[PDB]
Design an enzyme around this catalytic site. Structure first.
Site, short mmCIF file in Angstrom:
data_model
loop_
_atom_site.label_atom_id
_atom_site.label_comp_id
_atom_site.label_asym_id
_atom_site.label_seq_id
_atom_site.Cartn_x
_atom_site.Cartn_y
_atom_site.Cartn_z
N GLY A 158 32.53 63.18 -113.46
CA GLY A 158 31.34 63.62 -112.77
C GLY A 158 31.60 64.27 -111.43
O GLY A 158 30.64 64.68 -110.76
N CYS A 200 33.09 67.14 -110.94
CA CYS A 200 33.20 68.59 -110.99
C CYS A 200 32.10 69.27 -110.17
O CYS A 200 30.95 68.82 -110.12
CB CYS A 200 33.15 69.07 -112.44
SG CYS A 200 34.70 68.71 -113.26
N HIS A 255 31.61 75.06 -117.08
CA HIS A 255 31.72 74.17 -118.23
C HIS A 255 30.56 73.19 -118.32
O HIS A 255 30.50 72.41 -119.29
CB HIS A 255 33.08 73.47 -118.24
CG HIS A 255 33.24 72.38 -117.22
ND1 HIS A 255 34.11 72.50 -116.15
CD2 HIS A 255 32.72 71.13 -117.15
CE1 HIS A 255 34.09 71.37 -115.45
NE2 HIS A 255 33.26 70.53 -116.03
#
EC number: 3.4.19.12
Lengths: 301, 298
Positions: free
Chosen positions: B141, B143, B39
């Protein structure tokens, strides 16, 4: 929502070595060309009830100390004692030396411990220095010389070196200058910690965190003086607040607009009236192992 | 008795920053490949129903900015495996540990290295919940942060972080990019299935309390396995399998408390509560220690 979170341990892993005298092995910390470790590595079991460390050190030479990073020997070229720490000068500067400082923490402050055995790390966890200068570690035989630390930006602040266990199961140790936290001495004697108390500043940090998350039923319209609060706190086995405690609550007070002494009045009411079946952050118990810094990390990043 | 994470240095040496447009998250750099959540290629116009295959074909290698600290790595290829993007770079990571990719079972624990902008920030122990969520501490942030276990000198990567659920728990994938649980990498509010408590782990933790001298909850009563499991399921506890009973053997021996005796004690706790008492400091029964976790630390 809140969990104990340690600092990444890699910068400290790259500094761990083992230090052996005879068959006695413990851990040491290799920074630049110095290895730091507990001085009782030079003790035999016969010496441990009350060692004469100065006498034991005079009989030692550089070539009696085995320092190893993994299986690789580090040659010792000088030795000295600083309080309860041995400093071994070695012939190689540690290429993995981070930016670092030696700091002496205050009771209530938290730090990460890299639990090590034979110079090899086993695990990392967060500890709080209790008001009686003990920590509730997970330390087995061979863990001495494991260190506690905080990491600020690129810089490791070493604050703890492990030396011993007390009868109650808690642990005691020194700063990296070899000065014990609390009244303890490095001898194989049974020693008692003072009665422990609740870390008030951390409970207040917890209440601020509750407010940040929208849980604020316990706020009141009143305030108190610091002295009044401290006298009540002591009656509930809570640590009195210092001026430093008030100061480190500054950021959370600013974030919420709740003056420190107003939160103290809210805490005083909780101590005097109890929770009345209510929870705070989902708990009927107040939490004292999260510092104001810990709260800000996990809330705001 | 405290949660203990694995030392994180071997994983820290693999963390990088990955950016696409105005989206930045963390990647895992092993050999000459960087793994990260796919993503990163999304925008706000895409996040609600992202056709990732269409989005990816429209990307060039040069749209991916990978930074190892202050050094940019050149992306020489990209591909997608389920929900994980794989970016080939022209340099190999000399800090790559010996490693494997594993898919963990619900009830198993792992260490999480939480990272932001490719920089490690904290490490902590998590369990894979029976409903395939994890109770993490993950902010914006985070991920691409990964979960792992270490055995010998070998890192077993089991988790990469992708999303948060409205209840505050978290969801992610294995390093093959398959989600744990029924979750989807789209910007929607997703609910999990009903969670259950990891019974074999609660039992391990009670054994830990006993080894630490806490034992007010022990009793002389006993129970059969099936009768324990009937009560367990009533309280939304996982039933205990014979494998689980076997796994608790070493703790049974060490303490001399038969597994089914500890089951009888837990049964009493479920039906009566703890009545203001605590176990190892907690007002709640803890289920994120495995038997292995307890043993290794004892």
């Amino acid at each position: 929502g809140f969990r104990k979170m340690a600092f990444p341990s890699g910068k400290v892993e790259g500094c761990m070595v083992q230090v052996t005298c005879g068959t006695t092995t413990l851990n040491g910390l290799w920074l630049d060309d110095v290895v730091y470790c507990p001085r009782h590595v030079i003790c035999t079991s016969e010496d441990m009830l009350n060692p004469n460390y100065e006498d034991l050190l005079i009989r030692k030479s550089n070539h009696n100390f085995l320092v190893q990073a993994g299986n690789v020997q580090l040659r010792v070229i000088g030795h000295s004692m600083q309080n309860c720490v041995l400093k071994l000068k070695v012939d190689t500067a540690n290429p993995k030396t981070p930016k670092y400082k030696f700091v002496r923490i205050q009771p209530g402050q938290t730090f990460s411990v890299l639990a090590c055995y034979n110079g090899s790390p086993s695990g990392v966890y967060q500890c709080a220095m209790r008001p009686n200068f003990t920590i509730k570690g997970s330390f087995l035989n061979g863990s001495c010389g494991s260190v506690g630390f905080n990491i600020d930006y690129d810089c490791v602040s070493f604050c703890y070196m492990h030396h011993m266990e007390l009868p109650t199961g808690v642990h005691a140790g020194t700063d990296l200058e070899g000065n014990f936290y609390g009244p303890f001495v490095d001898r194989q004697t049974a020693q008692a910690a003072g009665t422990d108390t609740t870390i008030t500043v951390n409970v207040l940090a917890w209440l601020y965190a509750a407010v940040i998350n929208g849980d604020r039923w316990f706020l009141n319209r009143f305030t108190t003086t610091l002295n009044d609060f401290n006298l009540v706190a002591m009656k509930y086995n809570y640590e009195p607040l210092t001026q430093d405690h008030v100061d480190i609550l500054g950021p959370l007070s600013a974030q919420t607009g709740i003056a420190v002494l107003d939160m103290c009045a809210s805490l005083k009411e909780l101590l005097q009236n109890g929770m009345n079946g209510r929870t705070i952050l989902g708990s009927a118990l107040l939490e004292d192992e999260f510092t104001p810094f810990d709260v800000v990390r996990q809330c705001s990043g």
